[PDB]
Design a protein around this ligand. Structure first.
Ligand SMILES: [Cu+2]
Length: 192
């Protein structure tokens, strides 16, 4: 259980902006998600999750987390997260001298053994259309990472230095257990 804290996952930004209990939501993409799903996806910021027992087989992953449902990890109760918008708030990204950023994943329930896959929407992706697997390229992977003493995972990832547009970073954190729990988060970013 957890979420991408930096660059903040979509549902985490919605949550931390607040307003959804008293009709003061500040952002119009956050409002539209709320209109479709209510507060559930925001208060459940740490369980954007799907179980894939055959987790090493991407054909099995894509049968469970289906095109147009990646940001909700296939949960219809979180479907508002998947809506296309020009107004999703973006984290401005400047890569370090090695073309990296430190991704920070805040875990309420650390899980090991596990592994990580990082995907990036391609330059032809239209943010007004829900994300599909065909929109994504794998940019980096990680193995079993020990959680910090502050219950955050820190992972240096390499991103392309040729990008200057807005994109979705798609983080997959996969447990290596019988049930095959995995956590799927979309992070809206603006390369600058
Ligand atoms: Cu968990």
């Amino acid at each position: 259980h957890g979420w991408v804290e930096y660059p903040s996952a979509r549902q985490n930004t919605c949550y931390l902006d607040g307003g959804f209990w008293d009709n003061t939501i500040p952002n119009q993409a956050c409002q539209s998600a709320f209109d479709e799903s209510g507060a559930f996806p925001f208060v459940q910021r740490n369980e954007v999750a799907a179980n894939v027992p055959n987790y090493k087989d991407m054909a099995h992953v894509q049968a469970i987390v289906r095109d147009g449902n990646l940001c909700s990890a296939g949960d219809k109760a979180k479907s508002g997260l998947n809506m296309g918008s020009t107004h999703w708030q973006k984290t401005a990204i400047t890569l370090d001298e090695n073309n990296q950023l430190e991704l920070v994943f805040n875990a309420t329930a650390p899980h090991n053994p596990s592994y990580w896959q990082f995907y990036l929407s391609n330059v032809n992706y239209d943010p007004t259309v829900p994300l599909t697997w065909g929109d994504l390229d794998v940019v980096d992977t990680a193995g079993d990472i020990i959680v910090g003493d502050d219950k955050k995972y820190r992972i240096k990832i390499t991103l392309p230095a040729d990008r200057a547009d807005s994109a979705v970073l798609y983080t997959r954190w996969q447990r290596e257990d019988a049930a095959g729990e995995g956590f799927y988060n979309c992070s809206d970013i603006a390369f600058d």
